[PDB]
Amino acid sequence: GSHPFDQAVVKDPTASYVDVKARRTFLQSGQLDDRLKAALPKEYDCTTEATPNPQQGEMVIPRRYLSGNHGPVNPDYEPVVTLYRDFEKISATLGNLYVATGKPVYATCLLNMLDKWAKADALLNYDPKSQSWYQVEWSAATAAFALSTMMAEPNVDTAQRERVVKWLNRVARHQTSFPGGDTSCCNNHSYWRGQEATIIGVISKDDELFRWGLGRYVQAMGLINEDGSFVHEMTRHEQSLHYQNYAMLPLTMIAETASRQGIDLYAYKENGRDIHSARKFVFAAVKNPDLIKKYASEPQDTRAFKPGRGDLNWIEYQRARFGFADELGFMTVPIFDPRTGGSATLLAYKP
């Protein structure tokens, strides 16, 4: 690839993106505050409940509108995207239930669901120039984050776990082989392909794919402006601040996964700018949206910036590691985001 981490190696495929043993132990033993109590997942009998089935043949995501970018809607769009949103929500819930309870039943349920998708060659046949390319990066990373926590679990069908690990490896190798255009090569989509490649690289012990994933973090560091804003996200008019925050979500997971492999990616800098510069620009721009005026004249959509939004999951992982203050008062109710490992309140917040 040719970046500082292009000789990196996967040391341990069972390391995950969190310390499973240790976090489980605190959740069971410790004195949890109201926030953690509220983030504890509700148990249910997943063994008698069926899950989403894979689309057979080609993967096609229907356009949202009958014509163009707006107006009359296509009725075929909502049932297809709901299939993927449910696959992602169930994947993350089961991974989080295995971490909090340690019961092998939630792992058997996740494996039963993912084996159906593997046997059906899901997330592999589609048009790269279509929205299915983007849906694959999200769904494959969501299922891999959840599986990564049970890679050391003995009371599970190990030939089934291998079948599923082989399939996600194929899926990530195929989705990342396409370079993207002038924008998707380099903007937050490159970083979402980065977290996909990094966590699947870890569980399948594929050093080449892990390396390719870390290289997307390095790419990102060189696309930060003097003020901590990402070059490609500041070209999104009224959605510029939303995308500055959105890009933080995959970059935080590549760094959290790399750290459990003994690599300090957070320390990486480029021209006096690192991921901390970006975090500081998000916090300053939410308190003073006038900062975005140097890039876009439109009123900013701030729907992501309110307590409980999944878009804020990265702050749970970064605040637990560095201890900075919650300047905006966001970390009050629990946060759950399937695409960045589920509930970061449950997995990284410490009173």
Short mmCIF file of C-alpha atoms in Angstrom, two decimals:
data_model
loop_
_atom_site.label_atom_id
_atom_site.label_comp_id
_atom_site.label_asym_id
_atom_site.label_seq_id
_atom_site.Cartn_x
_atom_site.Cartn_y
_atom_site.Cartn_z
CA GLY A 1 0.00 0.00 0.00
CA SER A 2 2.82 2.34 1.09
CA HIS A 3 2.05 3.91 4.35
CA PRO A 4 3.77 3.68 7.81
CA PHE A 5 1.80 0.59 8.83
CA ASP A 6 2.16 -1.44 5.67
CA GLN A 7 4.22 -4.10 7.42
CA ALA A 8 1.72 -4.45 10.37
CA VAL A 9 0.76 -7.96 11.50
CA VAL A 10 -2.35 -9.47 13.14
CA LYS A 11 -1.04 -10.71 16.44
CA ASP A 12 -4.22 -12.19 17.86
CA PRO A 13 -7.48 -12.97 15.89
CA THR A 14 -9.45 -13.26 19.21
CA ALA A 15 -8.52 -9.79 20.54
CA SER A 16 -11.72 -8.09 19.24
CA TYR A 17 -12.26 -4.31 19.59
CA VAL A 18 -12.73 -4.50 23.35
CA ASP A 19 -11.43 -6.64 26.20
CA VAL A 20 -14.30 -9.09 26.43
CA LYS A 21 -13.28 -10.90 29.67
CA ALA A 22 -12.54 -7.68 31.51
CA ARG A 23 -15.63 -5.73 30.45
CA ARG A 24 -17.91 -8.74 31.23
CA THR A 25 -16.39 -8.95 34.69
CA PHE A 26 -17.08 -5.27 35.47
CA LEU A 27 -20.66 -5.54 34.21
CA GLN A 28 -21.35 -8.51 36.43
CA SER A 29 -19.35 -7.50 39.56
CA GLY A 30 -19.09 -3.70 39.78
CA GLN A 31 -21.38 -0.94 40.77
CA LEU A 32 -23.01 0.30 37.69
CA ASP A 33 -24.54 3.73 37.67
CA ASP A 34 -27.96 4.66 36.16
CA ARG A 35 -26.41 5.11 32.77
CA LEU A 36 -24.87 1.67 32.62
CA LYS A 37 -27.98 0.03 34.14
CA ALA A 38 -30.03 1.52 31.30
CA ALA A 39 -27.57 0.26 28.64
CA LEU A 40 -27.69 -3.38 29.78
CA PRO A 41 -29.26 -5.49 26.99
CA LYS A 42 -32.49 -7.35 27.59
CA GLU A 43 -32.19 -11.12 27.39
CA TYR A 44 -34.52 -13.15 25.16
CA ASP A 45 -34.70 -16.72 23.76
CA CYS A 46 -33.01 -16.27 20.44
CA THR A 47 -33.02 -20.03 19.76
CA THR A 48 -36.71 -20.12 18.78
CA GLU A 49 -36.68 -16.80 16.87
CA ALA A 50 -36.04 -16.61 13.12
CA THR A 51 -33.90 -13.88 11.59
CA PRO A 52 -33.76 -11.99 8.16
CA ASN A 53 -33.04 -14.11 5.15
CA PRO A 54 -30.54 -13.19 2.43
CA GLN A 55 -31.72 -11.80 -0.94
CA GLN A 56 -31.20 -14.58 -3.47
CA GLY A 57 -29.15 -13.98 -6.59
CA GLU A 58 -27.97 -10.38 -7.23
CA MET A 59 -28.04 -7.84 -4.44
CA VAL A 60 -30.05 -4.85 -5.67
CA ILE A 61 -31.00 -1.92 -3.44
CA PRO A 62 -33.98 -0.12 -5.18
CA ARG A 63 -33.76 3.63 -5.76
CA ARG A 64 -35.54 5.67 -3.13
CA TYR A 65 -37.55 7.70 -5.71
CA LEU A 66 -39.33 6.70 -8.92
CA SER A 67 -37.30 9.47 -10.63
CA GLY A 68 -34.38 11.64 -9.55
CA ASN A 69 -33.20 12.70 -6.15
CA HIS A 70 -36.65 13.70 -4.80
CA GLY A 71 -40.46 13.58 -5.28
CA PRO A 72 -42.66 10.38 -5.66
CA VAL A 73 -41.26 7.43 -3.70
CA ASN A 74 -40.53 3.93 -4.83
CA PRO A 75 -42.55 1.44 -2.64
CA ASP A 76 -39.89 -1.23 -3.18
CA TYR A 77 -37.21 0.76 -1.32
CA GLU A 78 -38.38 0.42 2.33
CA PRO A 79 -38.81 -3.40 2.49
CA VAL A 80 -35.26 -3.97 1.15
CA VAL A 81 -33.40 -1.52 3.36
CA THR A 82 -35.42 -2.76 6.42
CA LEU A 83 -34.00 -6.25 5.76
CA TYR A 84 -30.44 -4.91 6.12
CA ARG A 85 -31.25 -2.61 9.09
CA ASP A 86 -32.72 -5.68 10.92
CA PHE A 87 -29.76 -7.94 10.04
CA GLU A 88 -27.48 -5.23 11.51
CA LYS A 89 -29.59 -4.64 14.65
CA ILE A 90 -29.86 -8.38 15.45
CA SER A 91 -26.10 -8.93 14.78
CA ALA A 92 -25.10 -6.16 17.17
CA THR A 93 -27.67 -7.07 19.87
CA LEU A 94 -26.45 -10.70 19.96
CA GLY A 95 -22.74 -9.64 20.09
CA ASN A 96 -23.52 -7.24 22.96
CA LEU A 97 -25.59 -9.92 24.75
CA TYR A 98 -22.66 -12.38 24.50
CA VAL A 99 -20.28 -9.76 26.02
CA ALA A 100 -22.62 -8.83 28.89
CA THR A 101 -23.79 -12.32 29.89
CA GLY A 102 -21.08 -14.65 28.65
CA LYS A 103 -23.77 -17.24 27.70
CA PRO A 104 -22.83 -19.34 24.66
CA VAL A 105 -26.54 -19.42 23.49
CA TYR A 106 -26.23 -15.89 22.00
CA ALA A 107 -23.13 -17.00 20.03
CA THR A 108 -24.95 -20.10 18.64
CA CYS A 109 -27.83 -17.82 17.56
CA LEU A 110 -25.46 -15.36 15.76
CA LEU A 111 -23.68 -18.19 14.03
CA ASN A 112 -26.98 -19.78 12.90
CA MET A 113 -28.01 -16.46 11.35
CA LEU A 114 -24.65 -15.76 9.70
CA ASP A 115 -24.29 -19.31 8.37
CA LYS A 116 -27.54 -18.84 6.35
CA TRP A 117 -26.03 -15.72 4.75
CA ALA A 118 -22.73 -17.46 4.06
CA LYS A 119 -24.34 -20.54 2.42
CA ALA A 120 -26.33 -18.17 0.18
CA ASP A 121 -23.24 -16.22 -0.94
CA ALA A 122 -24.71 -12.98 0.35
CA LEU A 123 -22.95 -9.55 0.06
CA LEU A 124 -20.95 -10.70 -2.95
CA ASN A 125 -22.88 -10.33 -6.26
CA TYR A 126 -23.86 -6.74 -7.12
CA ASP A 127 -22.98 -3.70 -9.19
CA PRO A 128 -19.98 -1.76 -7.70
CA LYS A 129 -21.34 1.50 -9.13
CA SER A 130 -24.56 0.99 -7.18
CA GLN A 131 -25.74 1.62 -3.59
CA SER A 132 -25.20 -2.10 -2.83
CA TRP A 133 -21.39 -1.43 -2.67
CA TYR A 134 -22.07 0.92 0.23
CA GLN A 135 -24.54 -1.38 1.93
CA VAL A 136 -21.96 -4.19 1.93
CA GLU A 137 -19.36 -2.13 3.86
CA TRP A 138 -21.86 -1.43 6.61
CA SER A 139 -23.41 -4.87 6.99
CA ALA A 140 -20.20 -6.85 6.74
CA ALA A 141 -18.46 -4.68 9.43
CA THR A 142 -21.55 -4.92 11.74
CA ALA A 143 -21.54 -8.77 11.59
CA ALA A 144 -17.72 -8.98 11.95
CA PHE A 145 -17.67 -6.72 15.10
CA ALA A 146 -20.27 -9.00 16.69
CA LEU A 147 -18.45 -12.25 15.69
CA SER A 148 -15.05 -10.92 16.86
CA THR A 149 -16.18 -11.11 20.53
CA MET A 150 -16.83 -14.89 20.31
CA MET A 151 -13.77 -15.97 18.42
CA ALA A 152 -12.38 -17.66 21.59
CA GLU A 153 -15.73 -19.33 22.63
CA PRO A 154 -15.47 -23.16 22.93
CA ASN A 155 -19.18 -24.19 23.19
CA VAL A 156 -19.93 -23.33 19.60
CA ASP A 157 -19.79 -25.26 16.33
CA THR A 158 -16.25 -24.49 15.25
CA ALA A 159 -16.65 -25.70 11.63
CA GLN A 160 -19.63 -23.33 11.37
CA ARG A 161 -17.52 -20.43 12.81
CA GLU A 162 -14.80 -21.18 10.20
CA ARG A 163 -17.31 -21.19 7.34
CA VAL A 164 -18.64 -17.78 8.41
CA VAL A 165 -15.07 -16.33 8.91
CA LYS A 166 -14.10 -17.53 5.37
CA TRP A 167 -17.23 -15.89 3.93
CA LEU A 168 -16.66 -12.41 5.60
CA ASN A 169 -13.02 -12.57 4.38
CA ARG A 170 -14.26 -13.10 0.81
CA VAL A 171 -16.86 -10.35 1.19
CA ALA A 172 -14.32 -7.73 2.47
CA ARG A 173 -11.66 -8.67 -0.08
CA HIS A 174 -14.23 -8.20 -2.84
CA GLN A 175 -15.81 -4.95 -1.54
CA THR A 176 -12.42 -3.23 -1.01
CA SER A 177 -10.98 -4.20 -4.41
CA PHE A 178 -13.05 -1.40 -6.08
CA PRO A 179 -11.22 2.02 -5.81
CA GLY A 180 -14.21 4.34 -5.78
CA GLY A 181 -14.44 7.66 -7.71
CA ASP A 182 -13.07 11.18 -7.03
CA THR A 183 -14.93 11.37 -3.73
CA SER A 184 -15.65 7.79 -2.52
CA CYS A 185 -11.92 6.95 -2.95
CA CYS A 186 -11.08 9.37 -0.25
CA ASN A 187 -14.01 10.58 1.92
CA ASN A 188 -15.84 8.89 4.84
CA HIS A 189 -16.73 5.87 2.59
CA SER A 190 -13.01 5.08 2.31
CA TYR A 191 -12.82 5.08 6.15
CA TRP A 192 -15.96 2.84 6.45
CA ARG A 193 -14.24 0.38 4.01
CA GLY A 194 -11.25 0.81 6.35
CA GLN A 195 -13.04 -0.45 9.48
CA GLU A 196 -14.56 -3.33 7.51
CA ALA A 197 -11.12 -4.46 6.31
CA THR A 198 -9.49 -3.94 9.74
CA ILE A 199 -11.91 -6.00 11.89
CA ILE A 200 -12.36 -8.79 9.23
CA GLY A 201 -8.54 -8.75 8.72
CA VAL A 202 -8.21 -9.46 12.44
CA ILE A 203 -10.76 -12.33 12.69
CA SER A 204 -9.56 -14.14 9.60
CA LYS A 205 -5.85 -13.50 10.29
CA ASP A 206 -5.30 -11.79 6.94
CA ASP A 207 -2.39 -9.37 7.33
CA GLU A 208 -2.79 -7.87 3.82
CA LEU A 209 -6.43 -6.85 4.41
CA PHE A 210 -5.64 -5.60 7.99
CA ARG A 211 -2.85 -3.47 6.52
CA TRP A 212 -5.10 -2.10 3.84
CA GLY A 213 -7.61 -1.15 6.56
CA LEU A 214 -4.99 0.74 8.68
CA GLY A 215 -3.92 2.63 5.53
CA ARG A 216 -7.38 4.27 5.33
CA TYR A 217 -6.76 5.89 8.77
CA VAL A 218 -3.37 7.21 7.50
CA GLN A 219 -5.13 8.55 4.35
CA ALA A 220 -7.64 10.32 6.54
CA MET A 221 -4.95 12.05 8.63
CA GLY A 222 -3.53 13.71 5.52
CA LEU A 223 -7.01 15.07 4.53
CA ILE A 224 -7.50 17.18 7.61
CA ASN A 225 -7.47 20.97 7.25
CA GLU A 226 -5.55 23.34 9.57
CA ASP A 227 -8.60 23.52 11.85
CA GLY A 228 -9.32 19.82 12.13
CA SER A 229 -12.10 19.71 9.45
CA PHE A 230 -11.98 16.88 6.85
CA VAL A 231 -11.42 18.17 3.31
CA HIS A 232 -14.07 15.99 1.61
CA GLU A 233 -16.79 16.40 4.29
CA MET A 234 -16.68 20.20 4.07
CA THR A 235 -17.98 19.99 0.47
CA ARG A 236 -21.42 18.78 1.63
CA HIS A 237 -23.27 22.10 2.01
CA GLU A 238 -25.99 21.89 4.80
CA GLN A 239 -24.77 18.39 5.70
CA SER A 240 -21.04 19.38 6.19
CA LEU A 241 -21.04 19.23 10.00
CA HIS A 242 -23.08 15.96 9.94
CA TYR A 243 -20.46 14.32 7.75
CA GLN A 244 -17.48 15.70 9.79
CA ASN A 245 -18.98 13.80 12.76
CA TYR A 246 -19.93 10.76 10.65
CA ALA A 247 -16.32 10.31 9.46
CA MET A 248 -15.21 10.06 13.15
CA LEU A 249 -17.21 6.85 13.61
CA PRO A 250 -15.19 4.45 11.33
CA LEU A 251 -11.83 6.16 12.14
CA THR A 252 -12.44 5.58 15.92
CA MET A 253 -13.12 1.87 15.32
CA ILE A 254 -10.00 1.31 13.18
CA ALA A 255 -7.92 2.85 16.04
CA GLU A 256 -9.71 0.86 18.78
CA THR A 257 -9.25 -2.44 16.85
CA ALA A 258 -5.54 -1.63 16.06
CA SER A 259 -4.84 -0.86 19.76
CA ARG A 260 -5.92 -4.43 20.77
CA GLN A 261 -3.30 -5.65 18.24
CA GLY A 262 -0.67 -3.53 20.10
CA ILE A 263 -0.52 -0.71 17.53
CA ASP A 264 -0.98 2.89 18.63
CA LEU A 265 -2.81 4.42 15.64
CA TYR A 266 -4.16 7.41 17.67
CA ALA A 267 -0.62 8.71 18.00
CA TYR A 268 -0.23 9.01 14.19
CA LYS A 269 0.07 12.53 12.97
CA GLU A 270 0.45 14.38 9.69
CA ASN A 271 1.52 18.05 9.54
CA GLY A 272 0.53 18.95 13.11
CA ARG A 273 -2.92 17.33 12.79
CA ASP A 274 -4.27 14.06 14.11
CA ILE A 275 -7.63 12.55 15.11
CA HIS A 276 -7.69 14.80 18.16
CA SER A 277 -7.71 17.85 15.87
CA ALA A 278 -10.85 16.47 14.18
CA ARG A 279 -12.56 15.74 17.53
CA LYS A 280 -11.82 19.30 18.66
CA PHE A 281 -13.31 20.75 15.45
CA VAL A 282 -16.59 18.77 15.93
CA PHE A 283 -16.99 20.12 19.50
CA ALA A 284 -16.12 23.72 18.57
CA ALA A 285 -18.40 23.75 15.49
CA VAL A 286 -21.44 22.42 17.48
CA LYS A 287 -20.89 25.19 20.05
CA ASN A 288 -20.21 27.81 17.31
CA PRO A 289 -21.71 26.76 13.89
CA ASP A 290 -20.32 30.01 12.41
CA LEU A 291 -17.01 28.11 11.96
CA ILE A 292 -18.63 26.09 9.13
CA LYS A 293 -19.34 29.38 7.21
CA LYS A 294 -15.80 29.33 5.77
CA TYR A 295 -16.81 26.15 3.92
CA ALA A 296 -20.59 26.36 3.37
CA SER A 297 -23.22 29.10 3.60
CA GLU A 298 -26.22 26.79 4.25
CA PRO A 299 -27.82 26.32 7.80
CA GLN A 300 -26.42 23.09 9.17
CA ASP A 301 -28.46 20.04 9.86
CA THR A 302 -27.73 19.12 13.43
CA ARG A 303 -30.07 16.10 13.80
CA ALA A 304 -27.10 13.88 14.86
CA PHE A 305 -26.19 16.05 17.78
CA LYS A 306 -28.69 15.14 20.45
CA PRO A 307 -28.42 12.60 23.31
CA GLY A 308 -29.07 9.00 22.32
CA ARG A 309 -28.12 9.33 18.65
CA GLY A 310 -26.03 6.39 17.35
CA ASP A 311 -23.89 8.93 15.47
CA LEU A 312 -22.26 9.80 18.82
CA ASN A 313 -21.03 6.24 19.64
CA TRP A 314 -17.38 7.15 18.86
CA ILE A 315 -17.32 9.63 21.80
CA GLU A 316 -17.86 6.68 24.21
CA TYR A 317 -14.79 4.82 22.98
CA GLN A 318 -12.59 7.97 22.82
CA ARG A 319 -13.65 9.42 26.24
CA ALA A 320 -12.97 6.10 28.02
CA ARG A 321 -9.45 6.01 26.52
CA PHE A 322 -8.37 9.66 26.91
CA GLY A 323 -10.61 11.03 29.70
CA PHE A 324 -11.46 14.42 28.10
CA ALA A 325 -14.53 16.33 29.32
CA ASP A 326 -18.02 15.95 27.82
CA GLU A 327 -18.10 19.56 26.76
CA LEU A 328 -21.46 19.34 25.00
CA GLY A 329 -23.40 17.38 27.66
CA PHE A 330 -24.12 14.59 25.15
CA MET A 331 -23.29 11.54 27.24
CA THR A 332 -26.48 11.34 29.27
CA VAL A 333 -28.72 8.57 27.78
CA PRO A 334 -27.19 5.33 26.37
CA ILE A 335 -25.93 5.12 22.77
CA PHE A 336 -26.31 2.14 20.46
CA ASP A 337 -24.95 1.99 16.96
CA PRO A 338 -24.83 -1.47 15.21
CA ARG A 339 -22.25 -0.30 12.66
CA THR A 340 -19.65 0.68 15.32
CA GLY A 341 -19.95 -2.41 17.52
CA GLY A 342 -23.33 -1.84 19.20
CA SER A 343 -23.63 -0.01 22.51
CA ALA A 344 -20.44 1.86 23.29
CA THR A 345 -22.03 2.93 26.60
CA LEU A 346 -22.22 -0.79 27.52
CA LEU A 347 -18.77 -1.65 26.14
CA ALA A 348 -16.52 1.28 27.11
CA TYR A 349 -18.14 3.76 29.48
CA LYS A 350 -16.76 3.72 32.99
CA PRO A 351 -18.37 5.78 35.83
#
